[PDB]
Scaffold this active site. Sequence first.
Site, PDB file in Angstrom:
ATOM      1  N   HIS A  38       0.834  -1.201   0.000  1.00  0.00           N
ATOM      2  CA  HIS A  38       0.000   0.000   0.000  1.00  0.00           C
ATOM      3  C   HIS A  38       0.869   1.253   0.000  1.00  0.00           C
ATOM      4  O   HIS A  38       1.428   1.624   1.037  1.00  0.00           O
ATOM      5  CB  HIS A  38      -0.915   0.016   1.219  1.00  0.00           C
ATOM      6  CG  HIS A  38      -2.192  -0.724   1.022  1.00  0.00           C
ATOM      7  ND1 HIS A  38      -2.317  -2.067   1.289  1.00  0.00           N
ATOM      8  CD2 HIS A  38      -3.409  -0.305   0.605  1.00  0.00           C
ATOM      9  CE1 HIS A  38      -3.557  -2.449   1.042  1.00  0.00           C
ATOM     10  NE2 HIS A  38      -4.239  -1.398   0.619  1.00  0.00           N
ATOM     11  N   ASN A  46       8.131  -3.449   0.782  1.00  0.00           N
ATOM     12  CA  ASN A  46       6.835  -3.076   1.335  1.00  0.00           C
ATOM     13  C   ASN A  46       6.978  -2.440   2.724  1.00  0.00           C
ATOM     14  O   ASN A  46       6.584  -1.286   2.945  1.00  0.00           O
ATOM     15  CB  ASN A  46       5.983  -4.354   1.349  1.00  0.00           C
ATOM     16  CG  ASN A  46       4.530  -4.143   1.775  1.00  0.00           C
ATOM     17  OD1 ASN A  46       4.207  -3.258   2.568  1.00  0.00           O
ATOM     18  ND2 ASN A  46       3.645  -5.002   1.253  1.00  0.00           N
TER      19      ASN A  46
END
Lengths: 162, 162
Positions: free
Chosen positions: B97, B118
């Site tokens: 994200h 990440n």
Amino acid sequence: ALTNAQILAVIDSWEETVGQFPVITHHVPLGGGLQGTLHCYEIPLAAPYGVGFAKNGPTRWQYKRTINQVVHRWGSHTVPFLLEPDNINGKTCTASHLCHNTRCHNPLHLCWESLDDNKGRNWCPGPNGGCVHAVVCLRQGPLYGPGATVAGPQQRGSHFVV
Amino acid sequence: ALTNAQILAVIDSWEETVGQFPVITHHVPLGGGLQGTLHCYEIPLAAPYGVGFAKNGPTRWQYKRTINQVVHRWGSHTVPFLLEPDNINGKTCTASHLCHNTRCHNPLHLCWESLDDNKGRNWCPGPNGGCVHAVVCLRQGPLYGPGATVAGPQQRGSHFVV
DNA sequence: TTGACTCTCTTAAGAGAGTCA
DNA sequence: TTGACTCTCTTAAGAGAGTCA
Ligand SMILES: [Mg+2]
Ligand SMILES: [Mg+2]
Ligand SMILES: [Zn+2]
Ligand SMILES: [Zn+2]
Ligand SMILES: [Zn+2]
Ligand SMILES: [Zn+2]
């Protein structure tokens, strides 16, 4: 409970033993294209490790001392910080390797901070590359850099805006 | 499923459904004292979530489709990347994200990279504060900052050097 | 009292699969 | 076929505790 003097004695015996670990010179990135040198005091790969030390996991060790017939045991990197608060902002304090070298037990390469702070040092640009840690990093984090992202943000249709 | 056509059909139905999720505006730090705006497409807090979606954990969802009378299921954020390699350098690729908002399923806020890449975005200074991610961050990481270190490197005796 | 093993657990970024209706 | 739940697992930075001689 162990007295302040008894805790200091544990820290001193721990330092005495770790100080006799093999000292390995490592050349390391500092950020900003500069190179520096760290001297790690590395626990052996296999038993015996040193007086009081035993391996509880592939890269986990514990320190054990028996005081007044009671066995006390601590995570092997936690001993330098036994006189410090053990939590902050509701988060447990953890031993954090500034040298990113798990076998190293050099207390000048350790700090005591939340697990999030600890982890984040893996990506720090380093003391000469823009480190903003208040307790400054000793080196650029091993994972700092552009990364190896396989695929970026994308859509097939027009349903989305950024 | 197996065919590229079937995979494209999966991606297209996923995008159409996610494209109907509520669009929530989030104002975010970019680094360098600047602020930006992201439009997250947020999966609902409770059932029903949308056609094909079901919650398997507090902030985990899966997307499900029946192809050739067989149910195929994927982690809900992995669907945009079904045509990409599922590993890199021997490390599993993960949906990452860029907006640091789990409920968001906007594919313009997702990339596909190792778990280390990440995680590291949590501490990135951001696109206006020095981000070096090749697939650039959309915002400064939520954990960027000086940290809250309780104790720094220290020794009681004279056995250690940095 | 000590060494050398054994086991499971935490966290927060991420996963896969089964049970019912 | 689709929905709404249930469970455990992975990783890499970290932990506590038991057994035996
Ligand atoms: Mg660390
Ligand atoms: Mg992430
Ligand atoms: Zn070291
Ligand atoms: Zn730093
Ligand atoms: Zn988003
Ligand atoms: Zn970045």
